[PDB]
């Protein structure tokens, strides 16, 4: 079942709980990409210095 209402008409108590699953997963990924991208650029620059 999808979410019928939108942000203007207002969400329900149960419809707003569904949008939290995708939001928390998005906020949890931006905290991990800062460590993997910073680790990826260190291995590529150590082999292209000479």
């Amino acid at each position: 079942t999808p979410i019928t209402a939108n942000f203007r008409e207002g969400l329900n108590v149960l419809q707003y709980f569904i949008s939290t699953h995708g939001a928390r997963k998005g906020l949890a990924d931006t905290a991990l990409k800062t460590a993997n991208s910073g680790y990826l650029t260190r291995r590529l620059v150590d082999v292209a210095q000479d």
Partner: protein, 1324 residues
Amino acid sequence: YSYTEKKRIRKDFSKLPDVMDVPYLLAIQLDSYREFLQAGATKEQFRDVGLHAAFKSVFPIISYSGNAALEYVGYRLGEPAFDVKECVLRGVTFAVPLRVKVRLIIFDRESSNKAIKDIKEQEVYMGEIPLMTENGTFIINGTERVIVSQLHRSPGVFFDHDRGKTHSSGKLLYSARIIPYRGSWLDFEFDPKDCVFVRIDRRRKLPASVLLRALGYSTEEILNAFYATNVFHIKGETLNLELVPQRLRGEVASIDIKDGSGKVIVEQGRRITARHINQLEKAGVSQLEVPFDYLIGRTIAKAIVHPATGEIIAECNTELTLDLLAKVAKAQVVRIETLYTNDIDCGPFISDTLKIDNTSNQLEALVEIYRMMRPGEPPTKEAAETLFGNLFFSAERYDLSAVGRMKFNRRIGRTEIEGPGVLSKEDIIDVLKTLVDIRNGKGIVDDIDHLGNRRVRCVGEMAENQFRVGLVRVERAVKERLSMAESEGLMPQDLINAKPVAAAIKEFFGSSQLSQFMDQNNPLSEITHKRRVSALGPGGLTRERAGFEVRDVHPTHYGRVCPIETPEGPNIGLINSLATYARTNKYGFLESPYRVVKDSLVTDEIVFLSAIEEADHVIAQASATLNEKGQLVDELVAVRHLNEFTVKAPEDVTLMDVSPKQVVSVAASLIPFLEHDDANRALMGSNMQRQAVPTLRADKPLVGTGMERNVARDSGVCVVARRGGVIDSVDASRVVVRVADDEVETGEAGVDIYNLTKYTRSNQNTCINQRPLVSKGDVVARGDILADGPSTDMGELALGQNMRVAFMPWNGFNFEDSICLSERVVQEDRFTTIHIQELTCVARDTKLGPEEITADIPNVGEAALNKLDEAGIVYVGAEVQAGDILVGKVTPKGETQLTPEEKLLRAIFGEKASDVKDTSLRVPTGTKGTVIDVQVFTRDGVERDSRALSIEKMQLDQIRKDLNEEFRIVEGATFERLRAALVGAKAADDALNEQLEKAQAYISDRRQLLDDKFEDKKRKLQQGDDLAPGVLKIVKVYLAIKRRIQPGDKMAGRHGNKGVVSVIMPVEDMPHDANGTPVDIVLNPLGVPSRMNVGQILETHLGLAAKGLGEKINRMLEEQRKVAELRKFLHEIYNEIGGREENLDELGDNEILALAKNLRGGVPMATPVFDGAKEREIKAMLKLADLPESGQMRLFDGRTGNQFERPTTVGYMYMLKLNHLVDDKMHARSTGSYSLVTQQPLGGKAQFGGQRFGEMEVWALEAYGAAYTLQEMLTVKSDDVNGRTKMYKNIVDGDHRMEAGMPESFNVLIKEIRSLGIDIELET
């Protein structure tokens, strides 16, 4: 309808009726610690948690080679040392005396009742209890601290399913893990070769046959538990098979089973079907003919020993071969033993593992396990058998709590609710029986993210476990001392030691990650920190090994854990706050309230549902169609059956929510129009309200959520009247109320003194003050608000202030998130805050010469003498700035070794040489403030100086004037009640003389108590404090800094919209309307589409109607209208729109002028988090205030004067101010000090400020063609003693040149690598 609501009424748009009021927001902290104290003294002490449970487990002492038993009679709590206000200034940690009564029972070690010695001695001062305050905060060393809850795994058994990570064998759901409460854990894992393996809490691999042999079971008994036994006999056709119709279901038969006296059943190569299954029950045949080739795949269960042969021809639990039939045929064994086996279902996975290990004897397996835990140890049979039995079968080093025994019976399937703590032999084999059933396809693996498997600890559980680990250390030390000593020679008090007990309490509040500092900025941050529950700490997962399952939300978090409240950063998901209606269960789980729904109507019965029991009932939605009869009139209602969201029929509803706000937390319940914003902005909006600084002027928000009133009462900063009555006298320092004769005792009725605290230094360096809001002659009741604390206005939480806001890009000043401000926001002092800084000085004891604090110091100018007093303390109220000295501290020195350059300087001055240096405390650079208070501390036995007597005298004079004032009130009250009893004097008598004698004895009782309350207070003030060894006198001076708003400050709203002020533009450049009212804050409208927060725009439109209606009420007062006309206008506001309407219950003249003067600055509106007003109701309010319903109006520019082409949106938005001032962020340093090993610039001292040139900064310079710049900031500007000296001289002369030099970071690597024996030819 109380008295505090008669001043300000808040209109609410809530359309759903309230069934259950919001409980105490700190009920999880007060009731959790109350069980730890157990102040109730009855005959049967309810022992479920606390120190009383630890005094009953380790109470009996089993003395080795002796007879000494100690019986614990009980404990008694003592009176506190100091008050809550005296402990924060003296630092006594608010300790509580602990007295225990122990009984010494002696015996002759003969197991008889002869020569019994009974000594009863009660030990005093055994330990110190924290004894937290009423708000829930702990006072440790004069600093406020709190104990957050912990969310860890529940003790029990859990089954995991690996995702093919072992050997890529598809899916393996046979990972069994048992986590007990205390002691080592045993885990059962399956090898890729289909072999069971038990794993102790250590890196090792033990077979499953060794675990069964160590318990005492043989190979034949263990084989019967895995597979059932079968019967066989050799009669007729040399054999007879017992055919079971259930075992042959689903098994292909390649043999002939045509037996049955001419009745065929299954032919060769035919798969048995349900039709062939029904053929066997009607016939009832039990014996069939099977060739000897089919029995080869089977195995025996026990050893086959024929009585005629006399020797064992077949071993127990061994596969059958062709030679086994030759031995069994000649023996003619009528009875044949075998085990069950089936390739279709119930595969013998553990049967193959028993033959892999050489577990022949039970004693041989005990020494093999002890060798795995201790390699190279002595192979003793009696020594190893004692350690194994004391690991999983003894009360020592293995304790299973009551919460673990209840959970273990639910997973296994036992009917016993309560079980023993020590694991039994039946419980160890029952886990292996449930593990092999899940592998065959019977059952599923459990989930670790389910709230039914997790447990939320409390402050009372951690204090009891930390006290038990410290009590067992004092119980063990007393056992080794009392057993080797005589009962008459050793005293009962000296037998036990209080050192390990008192040390365990101090280390728990100073070395634990859970016990942390309490941030004190606004009353909203105080309640959020006490309710915040984390998953880290002792006995929990850290930030790195969490992964993604722990950092994710689960559908079982509905009404228990806030899904939207989570601190951003590295720890996302680990820390999550509780819900509003969250309540702990009896075992420790989370429970949420729900309503009882019947088939016909909805009853008013409210029950608290657990986590595991919520999967059966169908939970409906909090908001549904109601036809005023208790029955749902909707065709389809959103329900939840099993952790899923789906629409169901209205005839299947069994439960219903209590309120829509039961999902969000307290911090998230303050964001209006939350249903229109996104879940990402709701998480960031909850953090802007947490880091709010209390301003100088507190203004209530025009739009609220309704929870702003119930959040200030639960906080400890607001003064709540305990006894209702008439306010006799009110002042800015104290509030005195007179208690009525109804709710009072017989004596000392009107005795209540409320002392308001002044500006004190908080934990976050913010001012805290309380202002009175009641006048003399106003009656109050129980629960009324007499005075408000910080960020509080008449009982309502007022974090920031509000102003006129617009939405238009103004010359690019609001580029992405920047905010443009006007001049009226800084001229009216709206965001001006007050900071309180603490500066302390200590007088050490040097080995050269000991000297106390002296004001006379050498090498000082006449400018410091005028400000410094003769004692050595600056006056209270001076403008102390950078370079001014606070106290005078002399430091003795020796061996000056005056250089010839210094001798010439001392001669041109004329003054004599002084060897004493000046190391007095000064103000750091960039800090300016005003002294408001100075506190002194003197050790015991030292002489008081001229400063210790000035403050001490002023304190006792205030207490005496406060005690004499209360004595005058009770004196006149006793005489007034006495004069109102007898008749008037003109021109029985014996009863009136007794009343005069009672009045004379009444004033004598208050007088005798007056000196006792004055003598003990003078005793505490004259008693010195117990400071640390090596200090003589410690002085603390406070500085008050009034930081004004400046460009660069960080300002945000309530919907997660951060911002930095760019330029404070004058009042002429701001866009104004046709009337001439300019706006103060201009925002950026481009942030709405990406950062989807529709509630931010709906708040601006609703805020315009709140201030728009306030102008009509204030203008109506200036026209001197009748009171009957104002009551009609107020009725057109509260009784017009849908929601709560309250009126026609106040006084005509008195209450109308009181509400009109309070609502002249805006009508407060309440908008719930999920029951907000629709768009049709917002436009209806603008029509009443003669405002455009569209919410937009064309504004005139102030610079060019031309009217804008498109209409803009104006209104009033509640803004906040965050603690991100630029005074603590701006830093600059050219030259400073360096270290010794590495000549690098330092940071964190009085003068500091520098940027670390990281490795990623180096790769940015290498990407360019820059070579001289990269070498400059790496060799010359740092790590060069002789390089920086010559470089600084070249800049002053005016010659820009650089020398090569040598980096100091490289010379250290040369000397350190040469000590290892490696040669380095650096010169070459």
